[PDB]
Structure formats: structure tokens, C-alpha cells
Amino acid sequence: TYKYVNLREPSMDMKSVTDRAAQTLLWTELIRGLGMTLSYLFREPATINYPFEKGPLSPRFRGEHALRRYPSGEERCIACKLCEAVCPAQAITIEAEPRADGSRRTTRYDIDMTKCIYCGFCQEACPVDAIVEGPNFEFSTETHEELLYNKEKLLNNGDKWEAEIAANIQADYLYR
Amino acid sequence: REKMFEFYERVSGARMHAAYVRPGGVHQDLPLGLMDDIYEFSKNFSLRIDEL
Amino acid sequence: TRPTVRPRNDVAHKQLSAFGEYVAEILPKYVQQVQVSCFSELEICIHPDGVIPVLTFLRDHSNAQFKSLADLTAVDIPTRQNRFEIVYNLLSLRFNSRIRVKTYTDELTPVESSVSVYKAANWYEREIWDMFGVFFANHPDLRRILTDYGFEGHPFRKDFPLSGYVELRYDDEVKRVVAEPVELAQEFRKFDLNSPWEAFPAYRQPPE
Amino acid sequence: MELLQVLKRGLQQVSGHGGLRGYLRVLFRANDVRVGTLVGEDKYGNKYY
Amino acid sequence: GVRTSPTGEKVTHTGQVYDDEDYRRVRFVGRQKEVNENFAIDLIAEQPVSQVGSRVISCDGGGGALGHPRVYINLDKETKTGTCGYCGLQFRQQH
Amino acid sequence: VYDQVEFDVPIGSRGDCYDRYLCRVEEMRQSIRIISQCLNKMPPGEIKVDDA
Amino acid sequence: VKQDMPPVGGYGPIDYKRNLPRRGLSGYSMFAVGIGALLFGYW
Amino acid sequence: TSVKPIFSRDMNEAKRRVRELYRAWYREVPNTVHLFQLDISVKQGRDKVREMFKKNAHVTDPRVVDLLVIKGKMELEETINVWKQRTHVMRFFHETEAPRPKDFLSKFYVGHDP
Amino acid sequence: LLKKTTGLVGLAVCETPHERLKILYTKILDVLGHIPKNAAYRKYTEQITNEKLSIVKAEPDVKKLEEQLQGGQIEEVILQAENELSLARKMIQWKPWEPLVEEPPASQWKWPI
Amino acid sequence: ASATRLIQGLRNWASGRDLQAKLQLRYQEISKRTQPPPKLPVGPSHRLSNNYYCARDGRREAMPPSIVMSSQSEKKAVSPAPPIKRWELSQDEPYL
Numbered sequence: 002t003y004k005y006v007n008l009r010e011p012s013m014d015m016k017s018v019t020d021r022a023a024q025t026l027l028w029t030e031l032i033r034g035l036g037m038t039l040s041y042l043f044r045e046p047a048t049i050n051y052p053f054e055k056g057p058l059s060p061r062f063r064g065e066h067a068l069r070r071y072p073s074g075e076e077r078c079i080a081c082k083l084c085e086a087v088c089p090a091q092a093i094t095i096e097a098e099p100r101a102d103g104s105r106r107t108t109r110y111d112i113d114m115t116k117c118i119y120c121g122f123c124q125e126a127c128p129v130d131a132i133v134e135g136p137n138f139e140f141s142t143e144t145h146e147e148l149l150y151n152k153e154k155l156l157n158n159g160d161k162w163e164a165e166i167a168a169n170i171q172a173d174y175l176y177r
Numbered sequence: 178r179e180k181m182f183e184f185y186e187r188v189s190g191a192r193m194h195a196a197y198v199r200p201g202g203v204h205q206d207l208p209l210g211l212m213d214d215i216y217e218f219s220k221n222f223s224l225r226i227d228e229l
Numbered sequence: 230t231r232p233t234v235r236p237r238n239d240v241a242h243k244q245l246s247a248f249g250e251y252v253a254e255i256l257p258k259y260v261q262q263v264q265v266s267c268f269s270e271l272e273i274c275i276h277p278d279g280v281i282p283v284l285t286f287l288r289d290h291s292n293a294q295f296k297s298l299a300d301l302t303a304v305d306i307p308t309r310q311n312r313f314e315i316v317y318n319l320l321s322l323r324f325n326s327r328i329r330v331k332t333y334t335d336e337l338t339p340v341e342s343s344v345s346v347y348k349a350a351n352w353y354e355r356e357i358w359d360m361f362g363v364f365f366a367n368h369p370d371l372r373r374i375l376t377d378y379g380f381e382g383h384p385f386r387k388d389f390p391l392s393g394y395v396e397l398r399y400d401d402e403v404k405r406v407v408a409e410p411v412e413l414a415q416e417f418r419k420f421d422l423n424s425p426w427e428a429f430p431a432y433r434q435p436p437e
Numbered sequence: 438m439e440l441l442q443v444l445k446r447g448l449q450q451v452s453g454h455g456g457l458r459g460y461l462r463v464l465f466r467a468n469d470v471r472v473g474t475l476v477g478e479d480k481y482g483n484k485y486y
Numbered sequence: 487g488v489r490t491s492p493t494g495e496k497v498t499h500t501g502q503v504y505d506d507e508d509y510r511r512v513r514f515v516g517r518q519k520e521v522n523e524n525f526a527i528d529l530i531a532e533q534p535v536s537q538v539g540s541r542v543i544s545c546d547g548g549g550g551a552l553g554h555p556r557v558y559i560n561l562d563k564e565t566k567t568g569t570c571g572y573c574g575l576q577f578r579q580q581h
Numbered sequence: 582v583y584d585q586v587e588f589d590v591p592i593g594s595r596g597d598c599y600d601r602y603l604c605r606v607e608e609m610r611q612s613i614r615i616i617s618q619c620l621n622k623m624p625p626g627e628i629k630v631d632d633a
Numbered sequence: 634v635k636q637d638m639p640p641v642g643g644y645g646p647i648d649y650k651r652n653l654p655r656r657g658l659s660g661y662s663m664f665a666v667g668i669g670a671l672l673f674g675y676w
Numbered sequence: 677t678s679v680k681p682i683f684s685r686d687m688n689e690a691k692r693r694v695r696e697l698y699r700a701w702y703r704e705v706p707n708t709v710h711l712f713q714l715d716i717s718v719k720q721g722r723d724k725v726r727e728m729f730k731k732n733a734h735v736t737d738p739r740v741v742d743l744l745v746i747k748g749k750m751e752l753e754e755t756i757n758v759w760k761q762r763t764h765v766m767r768f769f770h771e772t773e774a775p776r777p778k779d780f781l782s783k784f785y786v787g788h789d790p
Numbered sequence: 791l792l793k794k795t796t797g798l799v800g801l802a803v804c805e806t807p808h809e810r811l812k813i814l815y816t817k818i819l820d821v822l823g824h825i826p827k828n829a830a831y832r833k834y835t836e837q838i839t840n841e842k843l844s845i846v847k848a849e850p851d852v853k854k855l856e857e858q859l860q861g862g863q864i865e866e867v868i869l870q871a872e873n874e875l876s877l878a879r880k881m882i883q884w885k886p887w888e889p890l891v892e893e894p895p896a897s898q899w900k901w902p903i
Numbered sequence: 904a905s906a907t908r909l910i911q912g913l914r915n916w917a918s919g920r921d922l923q924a925k926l927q928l929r930y931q932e933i934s935k936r937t938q939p940p941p942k943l944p945v946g947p948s949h950r951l952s953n954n955y956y957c958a959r960d961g962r963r964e965a966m967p968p969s970i971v972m973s974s975q976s977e978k979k980a981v982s983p984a985p986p987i988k989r990w991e992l993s994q995d996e997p998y999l
């Protein structure tokens with residue numbers, strides 16, 4: 002149930018001693034290493050042609066945050082603040098009020114994407130599937146505060162990516 | 178190592194920091210077809226160790 | 230209680246109870262409590278004047294042989310007058326066992342360094358100087374190990390705030406990284422999470 | 438010889454992008470010239486192969 | 487139903503707009519104010535009131551486990567429609 | 582479930598950088614062995630504790 | 634139920650041992666080839 | 677009311693140690709100004725060392741001044757060795773910090789704090 | 791049969807293990823006789839040391855002595871005997887059979903607080 | 904996989920291994936990116952009867968640590984556990 006790496010005594014007959022001295026003077030293992038590197042020279046490389054080719058992802062992927070709506074246009078979020086209670090980085094800032102039809106909706110929904118650790122606890126704490134962490138990972142900015150998302154940017158990410166977020170949640174809700 | 182990060186991304190959605198193994202079990206079950214790809218990785222990984 | 234409950238180990242519980250009696254009666258000069266938790270871990274609560282006689286015992290005695298210092302730890306408990314609880318985790322490879330040796334100090338009373346017992350302690354208790362302010366006597370090179378060089382205070386105390394007292398930024402007037410009093414653009418939101426209903430009746434304290 | 442098939446696949450990669458103009462167009466825009474089956478085209482002109 | 491302040495600034499669905507004398511409009515100078523033009527308070531009011539023939543209806547927002555938790559709505563007021571507190575779909579007892 | 586998988590433990594002999602290198606290589610070998618056994622012996626059932 | 638399970642007979646055997654497969658001539662043969670190259674060059 | 681000492685049996689050995697620490701810092705200040713290429717004078721640094729010693733001049737416990745000697749020796753060792761950079765030495769001189777209001781009326785003007 | 795190495799780095803092979811073990815065990819008993827009779831360290835260590843010395847006197851073989859002393863190699867059994875000797879020489883100085891030097895404070899070990 | 908047999912033989916010879924048997928690049932042998940929907944099984948506590956939570960409560964059977972010694976014969980010297988069994992050398996591959 003254990004084994005000894007490097008517990009070999011080399012043989013001391015003239016055959017093995019001459020083999021080791023030919024290895025020493027004639028560099029046999031170095032030609033072995035050159036041959037392994039030349040063997041990789043004639044392989045097709047693993048390089049994909051980004052951005053025209055993309056790295057493979059799963060529908061579980063945790064990328065850019067988005068707020069979803071129902072199939073009537075009403076937003077799913079009912080301001081329950083479970084996502085900001087569970088948030089390990091305290092990246093979510095929620096303020097709410099009853100709006101003009103008495104619905105329980107948010108007035109503030111901020112996600113700091115520079116505090117966010119992209120762990121997806123908010124999407125799995127959400128009881129109505131409102132906050133989701135979508136498929137987009139290509140959202141680098143030139144400014145720090147362009148990553149300080151408010152409710153408008155998150156609802157626009159939902160409206161932007163809903164055709165894909167709905168299919169990822171369709172492919173992955175039965176594992177949840 | 179990139180293929181094993183694909184295994185982490187398929188099982189959790191993050192390539193490195195999965196937050197997958199949780200107290201009480203794991204967060205989510207294996208997606209269908211994951212263990213076949215873990216088999217196809219492991220069947221060929223010995224030659225990679227051999228050439229290292 | 231079969232599938233979801235952790236299976237209790239009675240054999241190791243009994244063996245660790247017997248060995249705790251063994252350690253307590255070999256060393257009654259320092260041993261103050263001996264306890265075994267429900268998940269079968271042995272704790273030897275000793276007096277701080279006997280850090281070295283206990284730990285040299287458990288390292289060297291032929292029925293203990295705790296040859297590895299796994300982890301050395303302090304815990305701040307401000308409701309105690311000896312607010313720091315120094316914790317030695319030991320691993321005996323011969324008897325395939327682990328033991329915990331707990332002792333105490335306050336801010337001012339030094340603890341004797343166990344580098345003459347375990348050289349592994351050389352950084353851990355040094356960390357305990359950096360994080361808690363527990364001075365260790367006869368440490369070879371006692372200094373800070375984790376905080377910044379001009380850092381005042383000891384962070385892992387519980388009266389030390391989560392963010393510090395100073396933050397750093399590059400100032401371009403002085404061409405230098407400078408320290409200023411910390412001001413957060415968003416305060417850390419303290420959450421009051423504790424339910425007012427008792428969760429565990431086994432751990433109920435007697436009232437006043 | 439199986440080098441002739443390699444040169445013929447290269448020449449039909451040239452012929453498969455619609456001639457030398459399309460070949461050099463995809464060579465300088467894409468830095469790749471291999472041909473595929475056109476899976477589709479969106480409302481913007483992105484072509485998927 | 488997005489509208490516009492006298493300063494030319496779009497008012498969000500919350501009702502936020504900066505005042506005229508507020509300096510913080512200078513962040514939108516040379517740039518844009520991102521508001522969302524799909525107001526949920528308008529889109530849920532476009533839905534037809536669903537006529538049902540029971541006294542208590544249930545609503546889960548559709549899609550089964552893809553909607554909200556299932557709630558039961560009492561429809562005994564013939565003055566007011568029974569509105570889902572999750573999705574805002576509203577119901578009326580048909581008799 | 583490491584008490585149910587079968588693997589070897591590579592032991593060095595000289596305590597140098599080279600034996601630790603060989604120990605890590607053989608631990609990759611034995612990890613491939615454990616992964617083969619885990620793929621063969623994956624049970625059905627739930628993935629969280631059913632204590633809700 | 635439908636769950637990520639191995640196939641019924643299990644997966645195939647996975648190689649995990651060292652395979653450094655011992656190629657090349659002997660030491661006697663390599664010194665003989667080197668000496669023969671020197672003798673051809675000298676001649 | 678009987679405690680274990682750290683180094684000093686009484687206050688007098690403690691004042692001996694405080695005195696020797698001030699001696700060591702006073703000797704080290706010109707080397708500190710030179711090799712960190714500080715733009716303060718040596719007199720200004722010796723005034724700062726005097727200020728950091730005289731801040732603690734109200735302490736009547738031998739153990740607390742033993743720990744203050746220990747922490748001052750640690751600061752000195754981090755200064756003699758180039759472990760501090762120029763920034764850690766100049767953090768004693770709060771240069772970028774604007775002078776706070778000290779009297780009542782200006783603290784009343786600027787905000788709510790006492 | 792002269793085992794070629796112990797397998798442990800920095801632990802040399804003992805050529806004559808039985809005589810070394812007998813010397814170390816009688817030396818542990820000699821040092822351990824300086825401890826008072828009521829001390830549990832003396833009684834417990836005399837017990838285990840007399841058991842080990844009886845086993846060393848009972849077995850001529852080195853391999854079977856390793857399998858029935860149950861301490862790994864015979865050289866780390868010798869190492870453990872030397873550590874026990876050094877420990878007992880320290881236990882003379884410490885005198886830990888004496889009563890407890892100080893009771894802890896009233897809620898010093900109360901958890902949860 | 905698209906390499907010619909000349910380059911394939913050259914590559915196999917230079918490595919000294921059969922490289923086409925174990926290609927590190929992936930092809931149609933991997934799983935489909937679209938899968939049928941699963942039916943995941945339930946745990947053992949999904950029972951409509953004989954399922955009182957007081958009989959499967961793990962957290963409430965946790966006890967406070969049993970105090971063995973506290974400051975308020977010829978008995979055998981004990982170890983914390985029996986001494987660890989000597990490991991067996993591996994029958995699979997010992998390197999001896």
C-alpha cells in the first residue's frame with residue numbers, strides 16, 4: 002500500500018556500466034528529450050482562434066449579472082433582499098418601496114462588479130429566479146465605475162441576454 | 178489542466194473557485210455526460226505524465 | 230438516525246477518555262481540565278506555567294509520541310479576564326492520534342515559547358504576536374510576520390475593527406504610498422442574524 | 438504520395454473562399470483560412486461555420 | 487412610459503431624475519444616462535385580467551418551477567381583482 | 582470514501598528535491614488510479630444531506 | 634431516475650503506470666558506431 | 677495583584693530599558709535619514725522620536741512599558757535593516773493628512789464629531 | 791542479516807540493536823528510580839519500560855522484535871528510548887507530580903460564553 | 904488526427920510512443936453539449952410517513968464535551984489509540 006520511488010541500485014556488470022558511460026559520453030537521454038520535443042513540433046497545436054473561436058462553456062457558467070422579467074414584461078424581483086443577505090462580498094445594495102400599483106419592487110438594486118466574487122450564491126438564493134449570473138464574460142471596461150452596476154444596467158443586461166439566459170436556465174433548472 | 182478546468186466549469190460554473198463542495202454534500206449534481214469526459218481525460222492522461 | 234446523522238465513534242471516545250485520565254494524572258501540576266468532545270477530540274486544558282513540561286511530555290513520552298505540531302492558534306475571548314486562549318494541535322504518527330492542549334493568557338502575561346519543543350512553533354506564535362499581541366518569552370526572533378511594517382495594533386483581536394484604522398493610497402504630491410484614516414465609500418453592513426429562539430438545548434446555560 | 442492531397446486541400450481552401458480575394462480577405466481578417474459548413478448568418482452579418 | 491425632465495434628462499421607472507441645480511448631472515456630460523425603457527409597471531398593466539370560475543385560484547407565474555412560489559388568491563371581492571403579489575398577474579371570479 | 586479506494590503511497594528515500602519530484606509524479610499516477618475507481622463506483626442518490 | 638452514472642459493465646481499464654519504453658542501441662553498439670565513424674573519417 | 681513580569685521587576689529597570697531604547701533610536705536617526713534619502717532634517721526626526729517616546733510618558737505599569745520597549749525595538753530593527761521602505765518611515769510624519777480642527781468652533785463648523 | 795537502510799533519512803542503522811536497547815532501558819529505569827514512588831510518571835514509565843525490556847530479553851531476532859515491540863523500525867525504537875530518557879531527566883527537574891500550581895479563573899474554560 | 908501518415912510515423916518515432924491511440928486533442932468521442940433532461944433521485948428523508956425530524960436530527964444530538972478530569976491501583980498505562988499498523992509494501996508495483 003506504499004511504494005518506494007528511487008530505491009534502485011544500478012547493476013554493476015560491464016554491460017550496464019558501459020551503457021551508463023555511453024549515456025554519459027554520448028548523451029543518449031538528451032537526444033531522447035530532443036526527440037520528445039521534436040515529436041511535439043509535428044503535432045497540431047491546441048490554439049483556438051480567439052475571438053473568432055471561443056472557449057467551450059457550460060450552461061452553469063457564472064458570468065455577468067442580469068435581472069430577469071416574467072413572460073409578461075413584469076420584472077421578477079420582489080425586493081426580498083435574500084441575494085444581498087447571502088452575498089459573501091456584500092456586493093448587492095437594495096432599497097425598496099411600494100410603487101404606484103402597490104407592488105413590492107426595488108428602487109435601488111446595485112451590484113458592485115468589483116466587489117463581486119462571481120460565486121452565484123445570489124442566483125441560487127433568489128426565490129423567483131430574478132437575479133441571475135449570465136453567460137457574458139466579455140465586459141471589461143476602461144473605467145472603474147462602469148463596473149458599478151445599478152438597477153438600470155442590470156435590467157438592460159436581462160433584456161440584452163434573456164434569449165440566452167432563458168435557455169441556460171431551461172437546460173439547468175432540473176439540476177437545481 | 179485546461180480540460181480539468183472545463184470539468185470544474187461544467188460541474189459548478191466557475192473554472193477555479195467553484196464553491197462546489199459544501200457542508201452537507203455538494204451544491205449540485207453532476208451534469209449528464211460529465212463522467213464520460215472525465216473518463217476520456219483519465220484514459221489519456223498517463224501518456225502526458227509519461228512524456229513529462 | 231442512520232442516513233443523515235454522523236455515526237458516533239464510541240471506541241475512540243473511550244480510548245481518548247482513558248488517555249486523558251493518563252495525561253491528567255501523570256501531570257497534575259498543570260492539567261486543569263480534560264475533556265472529550267462528541268466527535269472524539271481530546272482537549273487538555275493546562276496552566277500557562279506548564280506549556281513546556283506538557284508539550285515535552287507529549288512529544289517524548291513513549292505512550293504519547295506527539296511528534297508533529299500541526300497547528301498553534303490563539304482565540305480572543307473578551308469576556309474572560311485572560312482573554313487569549315492559546316491552542317496547540319498535536320499529531321502522534323505512532324498512535325495515529327491528535328490531541329489539543331489549551332492554555333490562556335491576557336494582554337500582558339508572557340507565554341513561554343515552545344521552539345525548544347517544536348521548531349514548527351517558530352512562526353505560529355510569531356503570528357500570534359502579530360495578530361493578537363501575545364508576547365512570547367525566549368522566542369529566537371520574535372517580530373511581525375503578516376502585517377505591514379508600520380502597522381499599529383493586533384488585528385485578530387475582537388476589539389479591533391474589520392477594516393483597519395488606516396488605508397493606503399499613492400499620493401502624487403509626495404510621490405509616495407501614504408497612510409490616511411480609513412473612510413469607506415460604502416460602510417460594511419453589519420447584519421444582526423441571530424435568531425431569538427434557542428437552537429440547542431444541550432448547550433443551555435444555567436440562568437442568573 | 439499523401440503530400441499531394443495536402444497541397445490539393447490547400448488549393449481547394451483557396452478555391453473554397455471564393456478565390457484569391459476571399460482567401461486573402463479571410464487570411465488577413467481571421468488569421469485562419471480553413472473552410473467549413475455555413476451554419477448560419479445573423480441580422481448583423483456574423484457568419485457561423 | 488419613459489418621460490423627460492425639463493433638463494432633458496430621462497426619468498427612470500423608479501422616478502429618479504437629477505435636479506437642475508444638481509452638480510451630479512456632470513457625470514452624464516459627454517456621455518449617456520442609461521435608463522431601461524421597458525417599464526414593468528406598464529407591461530404588467532397591459533395584461534388581461536384572467537376570468538376564472540373558482541373561488542380561490544393559484545398562481546406560480548407560469549413555467550412551473552421556473553416561476554415564483556405558488557400562491558393562492560381569494561377572489562371574493564367583486565370590487566377589486568385578485569392580484570398576485572409575486573408576478574402581478576391579476577384574476578377575477580367570472581360569476 | 583478514501584477507505585474504499587485502492588491506491589499506493591509513494592515513499593522517498595533521500596529526502597531531496599528529486600525524491601519529492603518523483604513522489605508528486607507517482608501521486609499523479611495514483612490519483613489517476615483513484616479517479617478510475619471513483620468513476621467505476623459512483624453510486625446513485627442525492628448530493629446534499631436531506632436534513633433541510 | 635436519470636442521473637450521471639457509469640455504464641453497466643463499468644468503464645474500461647485506465648493505464649496509470651510508468652511507460653518509459655527503453656529505446657536505443659546498447660552502449661557497446663553506440664561506442665562501436667562512434668569508433669567506426671571516426672575510422673571512416675580518419676581513412 | 678501579583679503578576680508575572682515580562683523583563684522588568686519594577687519601574688526602575690523599565691526606565692533603564694526605555695532610556696537605552698531612546699539612546700539607540702537617537703543614534704540611528706542620522707543613518708535613517710541618510711539611507712532612506714529622507715527629505716526631513718535629522719533634527720526633525722529626532723523630534724519625532726522624542727514625540728513618540730513622550731506620548732507614552734504617562735504609563736505607570738512595568739509590564740506595559742516592557743511591551744512598549746519590545747515594540748519599539750521591533751520598529752528599530754525594521755528600520756536598521758531595510759525592511760521598512762521610505763513610506764513606512766515617513767508614515768510617522770502625517771504629511772498628506774490635512775490638519776484637523778482642534779478648537780470647538782471649527783469642529784462645530786466642519787461637522788458633527790467632537 | 792544487516793538491513794541495508796532504515797528507510798528514514800538521517801536515521802542510521804543500528805548494528806547491535808539488542809545491547810543498545812538493554813542499555814537504554816536499564817538507564818531509563820536508573821533515572822526513573824530517582825522519582826518518588828507515588829508519582830504516576832514513575833509507575834507508568836517503569837511499567838512500559840519493563841515490558842519493553844522483557845520483550846527485548848525474550849527475542850533474539852531483530853525482525854520479530856520489531857513486529858512485537860510495535861514501534862516501527864528498531865532504530866526509531868532506540869530513538870524513542872533516548873527521547874524517553876531525556877524526558878525523564880527533565881521530569882526530575884520539573885517535578886510535575888506536585889499539586890496544581892493555580893486554579894484557573896471561574897469561567898476560564900466555559901464555552902460557549 | 905488530420906496528420907499524414909508520414910508525419911504520424913515521424914511523430915510516433917520521435918516520441919517513442921503510439922501517439923494516435925491517446926490524442927490530447929478532443930474529437931467526436933466526447934459528450935454531447937445538449938443532454939436529455941435528468942430525473943434526479945430524492946434522499947431518504949423524502950418519506951410521507953415515519954419521518955419525524957426529531958428521530959433524524961443530527962445537530963440536536965450533538966453533546967457538550969464530556970469533562971473527564973476537572974479541577975472543580977496498578978492500572979495499565981494507555982496510549983491514545985493502539986499503535987499504527989505497519990504498512991504493506993504494494994503488490995501492484997513496489998519498485999523493488
Ligand code: SF4
Pocket residue numbers: 084087088089090091092093112116117118119120121122123124134
Ligand atoms: S455572485 Fe456572489 S459575490 Fe457576486 S453578487 Fe452574487 S452573491 Fe454577491
Ligand code: SF4
Pocket residue numbers: 077078079080081082083084085095123126127128129130131132
Ligand atoms: S433579486 Fe431575488 S433574492 Fe434579490 S431581492 Fe430580488 S427577488 Fe429577492
Ligand SMILES: [Zn+2]
Pocket residue numbers: 545546547554570571572573574575
Ligand atoms: Zn403569480
